[PDB]
């Protein structure tokens, strides 16, 4: 009986310490929740550098990766890009689509069966 | 002391329920929570930059879409396996110095009186 009461008081103190620790952790996590370009894993809202590729006749997002990210045909004219012309521009990625070259003679100048991304992006100016 | 033991069991049960509710709140907060980068404009020490070869000026330059020119340091060049012929590589900036072209026959091929930066940076390897 005495052992049960002592154990219950000890575990109750342990639970109280846990309650203080968890409440303080919650307050700290709520406290800590609050111009650079993305290079690798592309997500919507990321800042990217669109450069002109000539080997493939298109504009491609700067990528330090084997996968090729091309710019979408509808996204080209929106940022005053003419269908030679400008070497690079800065933008913000809005949507990405996984595509594959089903035809050997394509506009992307990629070999047959190559999988790549097509990105719809909009220009991004400083704020 | 059965009454005392039961009182302690109830109080312990209440405290553990409070702790579990706080833990569920923490998990909900963590789930509501969201989920490298290159510096292009104003470089400060420790930023990841993209060193590319410039052809007009016989040097490697940090990519900048800004009027000021950031050159790579002559001594830092061989450290990141660039010989004074990779096209580009990315590194981490370690120190910058504000300089001005005092002679018309300078190595940077900048006009007389041009102000620029010289940055010593080190290669960057991803884990």
Numbering used by the authors:
A (entry chain B): 1455 to 1488, 1494 to 1542, 1550 to 1593
B (entry chain A): 1455 to 1489, 1494 to 1542, 1551 to 1593
Which sentences did the original study use to describe this structure?
To gain mechanistic insights into the FIP200-p62 interaction, we determined the X-ray structure of the FIP200 CTR (aa 1458–1594). Crystals of this construct diffracted to a resolution of 3.2 Å and the phase problem was solved by a single anomalous dispersion approach using selenomethione-substituted crystals. A monomer of the FIP200 CTR comprises an N-terminal extended helix of 29 amino acids and a C-terminal globular domain of 100 amino acids to which we refer as the “Claw”. The connecting linker between the helix and the Claw is resolved in two out of six monomers. Accordingly, the Claw shows some flexibility relative to the helix. The six monomeric Claws in the asymmetric unit superimpose almost perfectly, with a root mean square deviation (rmsd) of their Cα atoms of 0.33 Å. Homodimerization of FIP200 CTR is mediated by the Claw (interface-1) and the N-terminal helices that form a coiled-coil (interface-2). The linkers cross each other in such a way that the Claw of one monomer sits on top of the coiled-coil helix of the second monomer. Dimerization buries an extensive surface area of 1,440 Å2, suggesting a physiologically plausible assembly. Along with these results, analytical size exclusion chromatography coupled to right-angle light scattering confirmed the dimeric nature of FIP200 CTR.
